[model samples]
Target: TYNKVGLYILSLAMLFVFIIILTAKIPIGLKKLVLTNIVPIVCFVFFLFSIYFYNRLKNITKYVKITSCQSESYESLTFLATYIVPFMGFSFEDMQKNIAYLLLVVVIGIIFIKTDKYYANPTLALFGFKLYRVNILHPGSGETKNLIAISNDVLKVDDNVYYSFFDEFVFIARKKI
Candidate 1:
């Protein structure tokens, strides 16, 4: 269970199953449409929260960096890539309580950790074949500063997107992305 790769694979499989049920059982009217509509909203909220979490964490910790795979709304695609498609592999209602519990812990933990940090400059993280460090300069300075801790995420924030973070700038040359 602790094997992150294996667990992630399992998670993806389970998520897929859920999608089948939702698509088949749910009506195409307001109910199904509403659920579908909410998918993007949920993704948007999660993306914002993730950016917020990364910023807050980076502010407090000197070595943490968040990687962004897509720009702005493109990151919203994560819902489909990371959540919805995965949901298609599993039955959500079957283990609703567990999902709820896990998300509850994550949300609470992120919120609690926010108290420990805050960003100043606020920069967006970028990546090519590898992750790169970019500085977000204040509108005034246009230069990177130490006290100015920048926080940023993917430029685009919607569907079929991926985002990852890189702390050690050396990784950029490695092309690990």
Candidate 2:
């Protein structure tokens, strides 16, 4: 369940971050220092994106009928929002530094969102989850063999898997392997 409003929010976040980066005056070597601090940068972007996805998923689940528990998404989102995002701020010296780091993160996330393969593939296969559209005729029949083959293709993209029968509706989530 992709939302256009979410994309707008992301774009606005990126724009704000970009403006901060453009205006900020960091000492020469410290610019390199921020660049070298890849962990914080990555953590910032990861947590930011995770928060957006968590919110988006929550919105989707409100209207969509999910057939699976989606424990993996919940767990990962919880860890990112509660732990990782806060940890990034611990090293910042002041508000400007925090804003600058957040700017860098949003830039990274913009790049990621623009380039991610999930958009290219109709079934948004992500690092910890698998989403696929399947068509089947009879229950556990020959068509089910085709379903297995399609599921195998999904496994090729993401190893762990879970399955649920949702008729003809399209769905996405993390499934146990």
Candidate 3:
């Protein structure tokens, strides 16, 4: 729970379940089915907050410049393939498969939580967020190191930006002085 990266992916798995359940055939009545609609509503609301949280995390931070960059938006699509496809094919009708899905969720959740690939966020991509693997120069150190970072606007070599740590491995670079 302490690692935002760990708990964040765990919650993503639950959100996946809700979204898939809402779309799966034979599941009906979002509100009338108490168990059904309730989680959907909660997760749906949480998802909205995720977008809010992303923007809210910003606070003016030290400025830097991109020395070089590579686009990584496609990485998010890989997550859709691995995280969602199996759930789409499987059904919940059989209680046995239900538990199977439950176990699968845990396995997937733990692996992703344990190993953070925080850049692969599909929701953020949909909202125009992009990741760039970049060599950035810190004006203070006058040296550069590679970083994987999130941004709402485009990034390119020699671009001036300010940055914040999004995780141990990733950061956010805003296109402002």
Candidate 4:
């Protein structure tokens, strides 16, 4: 399921951890103060408030069906896949200690920031499920229906025919059919 709140919380926690890691570069007392007190306290409050408000806002933002264009669908899938694969190659120790991993984290953070639509906004898209507008053949009408559909549900039945996860929905090339 698409979980905006969970991702938001995890993002904040990663940022907090990054800040704590950076604090190692700072001089003692102030670093200790931030690490031991300020960081945790602020993050805790932030988590509490954000989680609460997000749940409250959830009631207002949900949709019966969401929609997206091709580019966004591509970007969202790319973002999701890239988000995990780069880190998967690294060992746990390397993830913690490697400068390259830190650099990658910075890059990933920027990607997340740039692709807020796939993450921050939960209504238009959900985890791996984007509603795409496409022309699909209507079994009865014989003509195409311009419809909004879940991207993952769309399947290539052949060079000409496309089937959807939705039971009777199919997309057929007019020339072939």
Per-candidate Cα lDDT values, in order, are 0.33, 0.39, 0.59, 0.40
Q: Once all C-alphas are superposed, what RMSD does model 3 give against the true structure?
A: 5.2
Separate clash counts for every candidate: 44, 3, 0, 0
Candidate achieving higher lDDT, 1 or 3: 3
lDDT digits (tens) for residues 1-177 of candidate 1: 122232223223334334444534433266566565464445445545545544443333232222233222222222333554334333344557546655654554466434222111011122111122343333344343222112222221221212222221211111113
Index of the highest-TM-score prediction? 3
Candidate 1 — worst ten consecutive residues by lDDT sum? Answer: 119-128
Q: In candidate 3, how many Å is residue 74 off?
A: 2.6
Candidate 4, number of clashes: 0
lDDT of 2 by residue, 45-91 (tens): 75587567646644343211122222112223322332344346445
- Pairs of residues at least 3 apart in sequence or in different chains that clash in candidate 2: 161-175, 161-176, 161-177
Candidate 3 overall Cα lDDT vs. reference? 0.59
Better structure of 2 and 3 per lDDT = 3
User: Can you give the lDDT of residue 27 in candidate 1?
Assistant: 33
Per-model TM-score, in order, reads 0.23, 0.26, 0.64, 0.30
Error of model 3, residue 42, in angstroms: 3.1
